[PDB]
């Protein structure tokens, strides 16, 4: 479980999605807001 | 589960993340590549 901020997710989305594809789960933080979690379609369907 | 292409998601990540927090599970697609699914941290913890 890696964590990145919104500006890192936005400016580096292509690489972020490459990390996710491999198996990594990426949490996207935002000041005063609930974090979002990006997971692969395979991880999604397993659970 | 909603679905948006990479190009749209990159440009509109803020709206995507607000929709994810509002209760949607969003699939980001890229041609020839595995789709990524964005869930809220609450949905992720519930797994």
Distance between the termini of chain A: 16 Å
Strand content of chain A: 35-45%
- Strand segment count of chain A: 3
Order of helices and strands of chain A: EHHEEH
**Major protein interface:** A-B, 25 and 25 residues
What class, by secondary structure content of chain A? alpha+beta
Q: Give the count of helical stretches of chain A.
A: 3
CATH homologous superfamily identity of chain A = YefM-like domain
Widest sheet: strand ordering of chain A: 1-2-3
Could you name the CATH topology of chain A?
A: YefM-like fold
Range of helix content of chain A: 40-55%
Tally of domains of chain A: 1
CATH architecture term of chain A: 3-Layer(aba) Sandwich
Summarize the main sheet of chain A.
3 strands, mixed
| Radius of gyration of chain A over all CA atoms, rounded | 11 Å
Based on Cα principal axes, name the global outline of chain A: globular
| Subunit arrangement of the protein | homodimer
PDB class: transcription
Keywords: transcription factor, conditional cooperativity, transcription
Assembly: dimeric
Entry title: N-terminal DNA binding domain of the antitoxin Phd from phage P1
Structure characteristics:
alpha+beta; 47 residues; 3 strands; three-stranded mixed beta sheet; homodimer; YefM-like fold
């Amino acid at each position: 479980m890696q964590s990145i901020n919104f500006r890192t997710a936005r400016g580096n989305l292509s690489e972020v999605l490459n990390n996710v594809e491999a198996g990594e789960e990426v949490e996207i933080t935002r000041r005063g807001r609930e974090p979002a979690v990006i997971v692969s379609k395979a991880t999604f369907e397993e659970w």
